[PDB]
């Protein structure tokens, strides 16, 4: 199957997943001078105070932190969205070096990593249903740059040792996502897709202007994860990002 290697990387995904060369693929390059300032755009509403983290798992391509989405516990609303979207999981994409790792680019600038908080539209009842609609998902993307340590990320970092290989999971309760948000909620938004197979075109992307800073030690720890399963040859989990895709007519609107 698919990966980020020489023989199964992004350039090969189209073979199993034809939609890889569809009309609304992600990520893209955000050209700040071409983005349209839209004054009709409402402020984002992030309601994560009653979030319920359950666990963390190494799925062989990233590590997912999962949340209880059986009720409106952690939700996203406002901004470009109509209705309420529930948080289901967050994950990151990171590089082998500090100069790469992000999926979206800003004026061709690459960040060290990118945080994706994934939410599904409650009018669809379940995640599986929401991935059948063009307005099924909303992904909140936050860039990471190397500098000062992010206190709020430390809890995730310390548990990576326990889920080093593909298929390993750990109980991960009482984790507050609010510690991973930047000061400002200014954003760019555009209609896209999931950045991993099945590359479904169901996402409303909200990418935050303001990056969060994390320390070299913190991102270092991400780089120690393995794509492989226990008892298998070691393949470091690095560079698990997809290159920018053709914008193809779409328009990127700015909230600022
Ligand atoms: Hg869809
Ligand atoms: Zn992602």
Swiss-Prot record:
Single biological process term from Gene Ontology: positive regulation of synaptic transmission, GABAergic
Domain of life according to the entry: Eukaryota
Site (Involved in the binding of some activators, including histamine and L-histidine): 89
Binding of substrate, residues: 195-196
Enzyme Commission number(s): 4.2.1.1, 4.2.1.69
Stretches that traverse the bilayer: none
SMART domains referenced in this protein's UniProt entry, alphabetically: Carb_anhydrase (SM01057)
Listed name of the protein: Carbonic anhydrase 2
Mechanisms controlling activity: Activated by X-ray, histamine, L-adrenaline, L- and D-phenylalanine, L- and D-histidine, L-His-OMe and beta-Ala-His (carnosine).
One GO cellular component term: apical part of cell
Effect of residue 139 to G: Weakly impaired activity
Effect of residue 103 to A/Q: Strongly reduced CO(2) hydrase activity
Effect of residue 116 to D/N/Q: Reduced activity
InterPro entries (UniProt xref): CA_dom, CA_dom_sf, Carbonic_anhydrase_a-class, Carbonic_anhydrase_a-class_CS
Keyword hit for Electron transport: no
Major subcellular location class: cytoplasm
């Amino acid at each position: 199957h698919w990966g980020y290697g020489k023989h199964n990387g992004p350039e090969h995904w189209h073979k199993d997943f034809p939609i890889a060369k569809g009309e609304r693929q992600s990520p893209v390059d955000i050209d700040t001078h071409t983005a349209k300032y839209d004054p009709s755009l409402k402020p984002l509403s992030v309601s994560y105070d009653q979030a319920t983290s359950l666990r963390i798992l190494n799925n062989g391509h990233a590590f997912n932190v999962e949340f209880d989405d059986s009720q409106d516990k952690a939700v996203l609303k406002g901004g470009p969205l109509d209705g309420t979207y529930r948080l289901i999981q967050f994950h990151f994409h990171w590089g082998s070096l500090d100069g790469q790792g992000s999926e979206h680019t800003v004026d061709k600038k690459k960040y060290a990593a990118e945080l994706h908080l994934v939410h599904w539209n409650t009018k669809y009842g379940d995640f599986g249903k929401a991935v059948q609609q063009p307005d099924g998902l909303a992904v909140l993307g936050i860039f990471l740059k190397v500098g000062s340590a992010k206190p709020g990320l430390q809890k995730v970092v310390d548990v990576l040792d326990s889920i080093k290989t593909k298929g390993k999971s750990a109980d991960f309760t009482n984790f507050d996502p609010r510690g991973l948000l930047p000061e400002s909620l200014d954003y760019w938004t555009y209609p896209g897709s999931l950045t991993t197979p099945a590359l479904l075109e169901c996402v409303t992307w909200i990418v935050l202007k303001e990056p969060i800073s994390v320390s070299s030690e913190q991102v270092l720890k991400f780089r120690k994860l393995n794509f492989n399963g226990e008892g298998e040859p070691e393949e470091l989990m690095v560079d698990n990002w997809r290159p920018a895709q053709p914008l193809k007519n779409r328009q990127i609107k700015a909230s600022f």
